[PDB]
Symmetry: C5
Subunit: 196 residues, 5 copies
Amino acid sequence: LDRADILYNIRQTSRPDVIPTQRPVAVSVSLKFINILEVNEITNEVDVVFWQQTTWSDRTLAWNHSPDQVSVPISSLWVPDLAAYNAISKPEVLTPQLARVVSDGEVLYMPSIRQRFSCDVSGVDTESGATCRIKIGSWTHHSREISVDPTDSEYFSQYSRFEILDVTQKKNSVTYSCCPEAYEDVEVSLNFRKKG
Amino acid sequence: LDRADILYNIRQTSRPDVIPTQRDRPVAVSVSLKFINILEVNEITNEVDVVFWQQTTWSDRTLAWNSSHSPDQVSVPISSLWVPDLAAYNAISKPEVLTPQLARVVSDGEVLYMPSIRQRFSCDVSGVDTESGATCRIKIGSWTHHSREISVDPTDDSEYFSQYSRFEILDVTQKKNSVTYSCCPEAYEDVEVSLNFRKKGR
Amino acid sequence: LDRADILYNIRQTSRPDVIPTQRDRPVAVSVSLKFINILEVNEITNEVDVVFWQQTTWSDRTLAWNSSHSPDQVSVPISSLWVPDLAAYNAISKPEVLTPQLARVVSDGEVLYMPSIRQRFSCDVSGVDTESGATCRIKIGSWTHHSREISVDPTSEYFSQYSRFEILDVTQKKNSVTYSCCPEAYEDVEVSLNFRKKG
Amino acid sequence: LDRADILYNIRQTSRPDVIPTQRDRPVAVSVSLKFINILEVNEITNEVDVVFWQQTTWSDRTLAWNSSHSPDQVSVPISSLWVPDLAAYNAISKPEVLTPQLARVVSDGEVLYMPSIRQRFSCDVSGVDTESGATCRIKIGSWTHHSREISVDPTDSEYFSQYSRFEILDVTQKKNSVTYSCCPEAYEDVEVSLNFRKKGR
Amino acid sequence: LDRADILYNIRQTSRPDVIPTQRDRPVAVSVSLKFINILEVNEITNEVDVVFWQQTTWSDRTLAWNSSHSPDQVSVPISSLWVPDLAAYNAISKPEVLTPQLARVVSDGEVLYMPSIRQRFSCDVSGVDTESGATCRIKIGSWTHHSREISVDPTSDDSEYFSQYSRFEILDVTQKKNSVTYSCCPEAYEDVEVSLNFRKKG
Ligand SMILES: Brc1ccc(N2CCCNCC2)cn1
Ligand SMILES: Brc1ccc(N2CCCNCC2)cn1
Ligand SMILES: Brc1ccc(N2CCCNCC2)cn1
Ligand SMILES: Brc1ccc(N2CCCNCC2)cn1
Ligand SMILES: Brc1ccc(N2CCCNCC2)cn1
């Protein structure tokens, strides 16, 4: 097997529409914040840029003197239907939409995303700063099909008007009126402020 | 049958172009708006910027499958399904679909589709900054299918509404109508969702 | 024939790239604008932002079917039909199509397409804030098909009560114009929108 | 041959990825800008927002057909044709194509494509508000094809909007052949000089 | 071989999904930014709007052909080629590609791709209106391919193609190459840092 063969196989046998459940798919989500571009304390809206690190297992991609990994167009893979509940724009994907697939079927996808959110911006210009909570989960898959779990400034722009004080991550299971099942989400709390 | 098989069948066999009429009866579509946020109101221009889950429900028997020893539901790309051609009459921007465009299909052919949508509308914003608030009428119906092909029907208000909005929801009421338009002889159905909201105090 | 069969046939035999001309003659296209809203006006730049239903009508016989015991009409994705290449000459943005892009096809091959469109135009906005108002002229015609191939003809009821503006009158004029580039004449309809700001 | 056959043949046979080079000579492309409107000007930033028909003409013999008893012309989706990779060097936005993207093909293989385009440019806007006006120079040429592959050649207010805040004083066209540092070959361009000025309310 | 044959061949057999890594070594990608314009600067937000030719160079042997009696080069739609997944780390808008998206392929498999791009960046704009000017750092590298698979290296005059009508002028351009690790991953990924030193014109 060479890269070409591996990539050919994944393409022809790829089943993107099909959730790779084994005998729920455990999805890991983590936001790596890169920049905060605009803030509005009046409207409670922020414009953020972050790497959305997403991790899961699709055994149907696995393979046996060959490369251990390849980069694969996500259009050829099943991807979890994650959405940000309080996003107020559709995510602008900044980077090439490639996933990374390991021979055992593990998948990394980590696009850089710019997106606007509705959240608590109050206090942004104080010592203690604002704490903006972003809620991400599967849109249509309940807890028996997809589970999400977590995994501050390492990649954060030194040239932003703002700075990051802290990032905390909390996991939840919520029942919505529309449906009987519980749907999991991760809540990323971004604590930031305008700089002195 | 496993998920893969079900989704393969749907892929191959589903007909997105074909209205799942039964015996020349109209497809009964259920519509309900779950308001999430109100982003920018303009009392001068009478325009509002709203975010809502558009909960849409209908039956397409051609999707059904014997679920005796199979999954009861699957998530399906709406590009693989027939979807009702609903439109908001008083929308002034095309709908921005925020969420993955997946429908949920039950073994008996019932379909849920509930994308989160951001869309600007032209409606009555007068009084938005009063006790009584504004009452914004959003009108949604089939664009091209009359009452004998498609029928629309309604199904907490603020249950999913953002606590961080500058606004608050006082009430949401849903009214159903049947309208005849100058272009065409037939009647076309619509649901009118009345959103009663106001600016929050200082 | 049921809907499925009709739609299968149309998809299997549709030539979306081929203008359905009856012998040497031109396809008769009907165009009519049903104004829904006026959103933004600029009397300085002479630019208006308008929302209108673009009612378009023509005949494609190749779509017809024996409806003796079959549905009389179906809704069809316009990607599966030939559509006239109409454009607004004085549009300054590409048309934003607001509604599902479905046409309506009758068993005899008549086609209705009426999407709701938001588009900005360049036109005379002067006087918009006077009792007599502005008169904004919008010119729509086939872009590449001349009069021998395509002919266009005209056909507040749906106007938003919440617009800052009101419609005084709408008139439609059809024209045939010769352009520098080409020897042939190209037809267009001119819709004159007479509107003003409200009290 | 009817229209359907002609369009089928072209769709199934024509090759858009392939430059219609005849006899190892360059494809002669004609370019001409028909200005329709000037929408926004900024004398500070030296940026203009313009709308123009981009009249483009060339020969692709591989499209030709015996029109003895057939239509002389058809309209064809440009996605089905080879099109010259023309670009405006000083454009600062990608071209917004306003019209249906149809070319016109004559039985002998001549092609007209004339979409209406809105695009913003960086150019000399100084003097826009004077009697002589500004002269905004627009440079168009093949992006990747050098002079032995593609040659560009030229051919004012006729189609210009009476409702623009501006008016056109003159349009001149100049043709050039330039060698860029990056590459050994010469690349041709046409420079359209737009001479315009602000009208007054 | 004529152009048509070569292009039929490339199209028919080219795998855009496959990194053309010869014998286990990394594909050597050359990157160079030719700045064309600076359109808007904001010293407060530290954001710049830039237009540049992104000169990109690499080898894909699988494209090569015997050019004994054939054309030496062709222009090819990049959708038909493998292209390195380069991204600007500090870009804050997705790149607007201004030019036709054609690569140039030489008979030996060398590829040039040089689109003109307009993109906005977050970087140090401080001092833009002084003698020494601002120095805006742009970081470009492979997004998913580490140093064993893709290596990036720099490629003349900063202002050779720069617009004389810009409100700004270029004082200097320097290029630095680095090798950096990231949390998600054990391997090192290469990048080139282009330092753009510019200021307001008189
Ligand atoms: Br179809 C379909 C089913 C459920 C949902 N949601 C409800 C369940 C949890 N996520 C929020 C969206 C959306 N579309
Ligand atoms: Br095709 C076709 C037929 C009817 C309509 N309209 C009229 C009836 C109801 N919705 C408004 C649009 C639009 N397109
Ligand atoms: Br191809 C081709 C030929 C002619 C035209 N125009 C000129 C004729 C009337 N409509 C305006 C555009 C556009 N494309
Ligand atoms: Br590939 C490739 C090679 C050269 C160029 N340019 C240089 C030659 C003339 N136009 C400027 C763009 C663009 N793409
Ligand atoms: Br898949 C995948 C793997 C790694 C990364 N990143 C880390 C390596 C360098 N570029 C930044 C993003 C992105 N996507």
